[model samples]
Target chain A: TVTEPVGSYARAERPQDFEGFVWRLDNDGKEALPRNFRTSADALRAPEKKFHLDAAYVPSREGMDALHISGSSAFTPAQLKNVAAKLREKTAGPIYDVDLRQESHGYLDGIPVSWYGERDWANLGKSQHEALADERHRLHAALHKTVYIAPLGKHKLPEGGEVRRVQKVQTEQEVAEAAGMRYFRIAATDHVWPTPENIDRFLAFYRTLPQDAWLHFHCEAGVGRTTAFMVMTDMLKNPSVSLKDILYRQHEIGGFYYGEFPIKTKDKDSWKTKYYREKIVMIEQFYRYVQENRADGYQTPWSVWLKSHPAKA
Target chain B: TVTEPVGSYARAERPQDFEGFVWRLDNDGKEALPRNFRTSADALRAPEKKFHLDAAYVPSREGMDALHISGSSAFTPAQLKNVAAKLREKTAGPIYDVDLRQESHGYLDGIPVSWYGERDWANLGKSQHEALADERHRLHAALHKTVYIAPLGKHKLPEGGEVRRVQKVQTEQEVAEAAGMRYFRIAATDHVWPTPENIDRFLAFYRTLPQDAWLHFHCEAGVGRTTAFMVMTDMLKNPSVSLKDILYRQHEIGGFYYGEFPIKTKDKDSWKTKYYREKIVMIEQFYRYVQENRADGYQTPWSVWLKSHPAKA
Candidate 1:
């Protein structure tokens, strides 16, 4: 559901919303589009595009409970089911698969994965294929008990399994008819900011959900869009936390994605600033809206704390 | 023999002398001294101090005939000999052991490596010890026919060593009168700039040596003092190259140290800038020194080269 953006998308009222920071994608300073450096921006603009054919299932400490956060390609229905089953084990409670990418991702050689438009698909040799296979094998290794918080039709379920539940309602509804615990498929986008509508809807929903509900949110480049989802869920839990903190707080699996402002961008662009400013304002709005809108006796609405406080007059 | 610095130590009138550009070293962003980040300046201010126990072998596409240009710590006399014998197989020329740290190095458990003063020698774990061993094993694997142009002492010599020949009384005469090739033991420094005195001597000797003698040069961290040695050698062989060309030329082993400069200072103390500046003026001196001194049909005297460039400058 498309929600409203906070403040103007024009010049980011506060240019330092992201603290004037950005990060590069690779060690070998190459930042091409669809493939190289600007994946987050590219993925955000075109949410429909499957950008991770060679997606590495980024491991957080290479442990049990690590979320499959950042990645490239998508997994098959069967692969999805298998991945979901094990992922469920690492947690002590319910799980949520907040898929932000496509439903039926393009696959090759019976393996589920896809590539960007201008990719050198034909030249990939045996080793690349083998590596991808090993990658996917682990990609879905922890994908158990996943509540699909995305669109329902044709998205991944445990190994071509039965639908969790087919319903169209705003309130809480668990998929008790099928195998795994739950699947909350509330479709969102990789580009747009989280509006008052989705933020309120999800926050209300999360309150009723298990306290330890593990979330697996993602977009093409693993961040950009995925981060907003992370930001929202976190704020809903702890309304007082600042937007900047949400944007940077460490995920054991992925460390702090916003760690120290990408060394590679040592003297350059603020593309990351774009990603952050857009998200931070919206998350900030969710904070402010909750503060201003929430009835008394409910929690106080909120405030958005920033390391770089109030803008220059 | 310390030579004369180029232009003036005060300031190389032509600021472009060192080409005025540098790269950052810290990923964490905190640059202190001795232990933290600032090293080039610190190393230059004190050359005799041991610099790299954690030195990276600096791979520039390792080859069969690569020369060892930078190092510290020393090895047993036998350790030196055995290594020299093996190095001979890789190259089709005479070899040398260029020592820059000490007359001989402290060895233990049969490993011929040393440590920096502030280094945590007492606390190195298994990983550190293991890595250095593998490092030294390969350090000499590609180090056969080297022209030891640093210092002469009890440093490692190839088991089947032979004297290359030593005639000059003004410098080190350790062509050992031994069994195998040469070991350039001409003492130099980690702090001082390369001058005309030593530069003239080597260039003169090189002219009479075999048409192809493999040379190995080094200093504390390798590059600070090492780069100037390299700059002078190239100019001696080809006098027409510019100071920038001399400073940025292809390093025999690690290729161009300035290969990327990270892509992007003024003068003075950016420890890195210090490294680049100090060496720039010195090497620029080599460029100018030869232009002013090399008589007709003579590249003029000589200079010894070292390794490790300007502490991640």
Candidate 2:
């Protein structure tokens, strides 16, 4: 799934071989590294030392098709089935799957939408945090096409799909028009576990889908936030399984792990304090809602949100 | 005599000092000496030699008059007598006459006039001899004043009376009416000796004189030629002597000796031969024709002859 032009990555001789790319990295205060997709076992032995592989592949032939995957790793069973169905309807190739934590997405392969953080980041006093958030959102938007599912706010899909919101995020419409791209709005939101209300909203939104919806989930740094969201989504769609069994199955499919007991005790039940306290409570409530309502099988919440919020007639 | 004011002989310090009074003595090219009147005896000595006393000397009342005398060996009898007379006239004191020969002439005494004999002696051409003779007559006429016993020419004198001529053989006269001095014509001819035929004419010229008459003679280089005429005139006025005797007498009085033989034997016998052949013949003939007729001695016979034969003149 190579989308960039062949000569886009330049090579130089000897010490100056990486000067152009190295200088850009130095200017942005980011580390430069070599990337490979299909690496050998010997290559993977020193993967952290020299080259970085794409966490997941995104097939360029899928055109405008999108995908939803489990956080920090591979996809859940239902999310995989949803993306594969969409690929079957859109193209002849297999589903080109990708992970948000590993694959970079932007207009040009993770070239950040703004080299300098935006004005909102400055005004909101969240330059560093929002810069990373913006980078994650842009990556998701570029990887999947018009509609992408990612865990956003607590349980709501905001007003539109996260991908649509991100596509419309402070961009000049003229730029999209000039590039012959149609702008669509999609509603997406997070579904955390142990939170009944969040699970109920996630199941309702998922049932309103077209049976082939792309989804995304993320939190600050994408690790803990997307993990909780993915666990709850999986539990709601599989209500007959125990929570530990569901978590174990989620981990087996490269889903984020929510360890046993959820809560942590210091010195023999001194207090029932979770290791990740609010995160555990949120995920638990989400699971309880899905079990009571029996809506864990629902998959395309963003499609339902879009139907509920139509454009002005 | 230092008749010319401040006349003192100076020896040659270098060759250039001999310019005016000296000449080349030989064809072989030898420098001639200056005229020196000191005797041989005084000339040989050094340091304190005797010298001829000047004619202008006047003895002082204290019997000592400063007479000009260089340290020369040769002092003529006439010069000595003149010094004695001046001493007697100026002061009635004893005279201490020095014998210069006893002492050699000192360094200050100059070379004598005879030393130039070979240098200036030249055989006169016929016209030149005649011109010289004419010049002698003209000089005699111009200086015919301040007479002594010597008459102008061979004119007769009255009985018991001497011919009247200037006592000094030299005289300065005003021949032309010019503003400055006319000429300096010396009388050497009449005082030395008179021609036999001219004796009577000289006596006659003296007889006609009122009180004063003068005569003169000279030649170029003044010394030898003028001295010869002087000896001749002196012989005539004080007679009863041969030409040799007259010459010998002059040698005693004035350290002047004109012999009857020529001093040089190149073309003639001795001075004796020159005296009789040249001097006697020329003066006797001139005396017989002109002075006997009582004609003016100033007019040369050549001029008279030129007037009569204009073509040949």
Candidate 3:
């Protein structure tokens, strides 16, 4: 029997305090001010303002790529150098900066400089803006000249209809070199899964890492891209460990639990699920690849294997 | 071209330290000795030996069910008393015990007494076992006399063919009363979603509670049933807060992330997925129900609505 619906049937909207719910769990609820686009002075004075640096050391997996830092950003060369020094104390090996942001530093840095003025702010004027931009550029150059160690070759990133040439941020190499480390670029999709090609390249590069390598992974929030690669590293090494376990462990440390691949629903809520379903499929396929490779006695890296065999996914 | 599988193709087993990985995240990695069946003295001396009691107080929801304790178990009356006192200190109101265990106290208590002899152990002789058994019975009687407050009526718990009438634990009612608290029973399946019938009854019972009700939800592990009901309560009250947010918060508190409803596969790993797929479907349907209900009006509790209307699920 049908019962007549009662009361006001307005659709539920997000709670007013919803952002607070999102805020408390991240970075263990550490409070940090918003970035000051005008100048890097605040960040230099308070290093935390630079970005969140979540450094983790796996004591159990000692002497074999132990320390891993999954972080957000460092604006200037001094900031990067400061981070490198702190990370160096935590691990035996040199820090490997793995920058995964699709938009390179030059582009991101240019925005702030242009916003204040195609140039500078009214109060700060052109010189201040120029100086700040110069610092930003120098950081890029240090990373390019010293740190920016590219992979064997540039790979393609899957886009709408076809693949696009993933740009190599050449400037970051020397910067990493200045900071006494190496920089590697792994261009990954923002809020989506890396292509099988990217995964192959990732696997190939990952294979060449020194046993004592300590890597730093970063994207805008140090969440989606950084977490994806970190979990991939975990899954790549520990084939016996299920994806669920690896994902759970990562989630425990403030990463989004990929397990809750958002369900498809009508309305705008489906946006993430519609898009992230691709990510889930890729992760599952990657997991399956690792499993199958382990089954076959990991003879060749995924990059090498891809040349001869098509991905079953 | 397809590549032939090489080397040994045996599937990967769970890692040797797999259990340790699971253990570290739970109880904040507290080391507690396993339960000693022989004596109650161990638990009395060190209460942690009893069972895990995870208590959380959301100060924001101060006047409305401020304190919640999701726990494993408490063997003796003294152990239960200890737990109750600790809980009493945490909340302003009397603690409401919501025991969701399907198996009643008498039946479960009988097993231990029988296992040692139907009877007692060898080293301690029959008297010690009898005394221990006596303590257990007294605890059960206390719970029955004062604590075990059954729901309005016996609700049916759906199984394979037809629903079975849920048994009320009459003993725990008095125990809760004696302890200056109230006990209510809501029989739930071990590792599955509650039938709509059970959910209806739970909603009805939940509606009767005072605004300042302090709840203690328990099953064997306080992971599955406890987490489900807790999330349900959250969903019931805060319709706008997505299930993903609620589930993520619970996972942070050491509960299993049901978001990872095990995916279907051919292997025995599919057992949970096969069963749990039903749970995922039910939860999604329930979420939809709440959304729809909120849209119309929140005039009647789910129990009232169920009487006149067939569940859309």
Candidate with the greatest TM-score versus the true structure: 3
TM-score to native of every candidate shown: 0.26, 0.22, 0.30
Where is the poorest 10-residue window by lDDT in model 2 chain A? A18-27
Model 1 ranges with Cα > 4 A deviation: A1-313, B1-87, B90-92, B102-110, B113-180, B195-197, B240-246, B251-272, B291-295, B299-313
Q: What is the TM-score of chain B in candidate 1?
A: 0.43
For every candidate, C-alpha RMSD to the true structure in Å: 25.7, 62.1, 30.7
Runs in model 3 lying further than 4 Å from the true structure: A1-69, A73-76, A107-170, A261-270, A295-297, A300-313, B1-313
Sort every candidate by TM-score, greatest first: 3, 1, 2
TM-score, candidate 2, first chain: 0.36
Q: Of the candidates numbered 1 and 2, which has the greater lDDT value? A: 1
lDDT string, candidate 2, A1-313, tens digits: 5332111111111211111000011011132211111100111121121112223422121111122332322222332344345334543432223222211122322222321111011112222334346455554443323222222222211111112112333221222233232222111111212223233354555555444443444322334435555555455444555765554444434334455333434464332232244344334544554554455443434333333432121
Count residue pairs with overlapping backbones in model 1: 72
By lDDT, the better pick of 1 and 3 is: 3
lDDT of 3 by residue, A167-209 (tens): 3332454556777878886655455555444566677778788
For residue A207, model 3's alpha carbon misses the true position, in angstroms, by 1.1
Model 1 has a DockQ score of 0.00
**Per-residue lDDT for B40 in model 2?**
13
| Candidate 1 residue-wise lDDT, B1-313, digit = tens | 2231332232232211211010101011122111111111112121211221113322222222232222212333343454455545545677655544321222222222332211111111223334335334433332321111112111111111111112221111232224265766433433344434444555665666575565555444454445555555556655655544433333423322432232123233233344344554455444555676566655323332221111111
lDDT by residue (B1-313, candidate 3, tens digit) is 2121111011122211111000000111122211111110111121121122222422122212332544443233334455677667766775776766443242222111111110011111122234335435543543222111111111111111111122222245555565677887765544556545457778777767776666766654466677677667767666666666555544445444455442544563454443465555555656666776776555666545544543322
